[PDB]
Homo-oligomer: 127 residues x 3
C-alpha cells in the first residue's frame, strides 16, 4: 500500500491521493485535463484527452511502471460527439508507447469536476 | 501475468481496447454493450439488451478459462432507472441459471452510452 | 477465496448482489447509497447522506476484518456537483477521524441514482 505522488500530474485538490501502489497492482485516481504546472484546462477536446492521458501516465511511471502495464481504463465523457476525437488520441497515445490497448469502459456522464470534457482512471500491473 | 482475451463469441473490439485481460489471479472485461457478436445488431427491448450484455460478459469470462460463477464484481451503467426492475430480473435469472453466487455490484444512471445502448456492463472475475 | 461479506450494520441486499466480497488480498464492496440500516430511510441533507454511504462502506469493510485505513480506491457517483465541496468536507473528516490516508478516487456526476439519493460510493480495500 504505497502512496504515489508526482509533480507531473496535478497535485491533489481534495481528500484523495494520485495513486496507490499495492505491489502487484497500481490504481490511479480519475485524471482530468488540468495542466500540472499552470493548473489550466485546455479548451479543445483533443488536447483534454492527451492531457488526461499524460496525467495517468505520470502516476503510473512514478510507480515505476509503463503505459504497457495499464490493463484497465474507464473514460468518463460529457459529450458523445467528442468520442471519435477522444478515441483517436487514446489510440495514438497507446501506439506511441508501443503498448497494446487496455480493457476499457466508456460512459457519457452529466458533468465532471471543473466542467472538463473527460476523466480517465487506470489500473496497471507490475507483471 | 497479462494475457489478452480475444473471442468471436463477444462483439469485436471496435476501437482502441481489448475485450478482456487475464492477469492470472484476476480477469477484467471491457464494458460490454448489447451488440450482437455475429450480426452487430442492437436489440430494441431492454430485456433483450440486458440479456445480451450479460452474454457478452460471459463469452469473455469463459474465453479466459473461467465461468459466470467466478464473477466477483460488476458495474452496470444504465440510461434509465425505470428499466431497472427488468434489468434486475434478467440479471438475477442469469446468475441463477448458472448456479452462481451474486457478485458485488454498482448501478448508476448515466447520460448516454456508446451506440445509444441502454446499459453497459463491466466485470471482474477471479480464478479461485 | 470468494467469501461473501454479510453485515447488519449496512443495509441488507435488495436483489441479485451481495454487500461485499473478500478475495483474500482485497475486498470489493457494492455501491453504497445513504439508506439507514435501522430505518430503511434516506436523510434529506447531503452531509448526512455522504456520512451514511461512508458508514455503510465501513460496515462492510469492517465485516471483512479490515478498517477504514485499508480502503485504497473509492468511486463517488453524485447527482449534483454543487454538492461536491460539501461531500468532500464530510469525506475528508471521515478519513481524518479514522487516522486514514486518503484512498485513490474518481468522482463523476451521473444523471440518477437508486432511490434518488444524492451519492453512491463503492470501495476496494486491501488486507496487506
Amino acid at each position: 500500500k504505497k502512496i504515489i505522488e508526482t509533480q507531473r500530474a496535478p497535485g491533489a485538490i481534495g481528500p484523495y491521493v494520485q495513486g496507490v501502489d499495492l505491489g502487484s497492482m497500481v490504481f490511479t485516481s480519475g485524471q482530468i485535463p488540468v495542466c500540472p504546472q499552470t493548473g489550466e484546462i485546455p479548451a479543445d477536446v483533443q488536447d483534454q484527452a492527451r492531457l488526461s492521458l499524460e496525467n495517468v501516465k505520470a502516476i503510473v511511471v512514478a510507480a515505476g511502471l509503463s503505459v504497457g502495464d495499464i490493463i484497465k481504463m474507464t473514460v468518463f465523457i460529457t459529450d458523445l460527439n467528442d468520442f471519435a476525437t477522444i478515441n483517436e488520441v487514446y489510440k495514438q497515445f497507446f501506439d506511441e508507447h508501443q503498448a497494446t490497448y487496455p480493457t476499457r469502459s466508456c460512459v457519457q456522464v452529466a458533468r465532471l469536476p471543473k466542467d472538463v470534457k473527460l476523466e480517465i482512471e487506470a489500473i496497471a500491473v507490475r507483471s
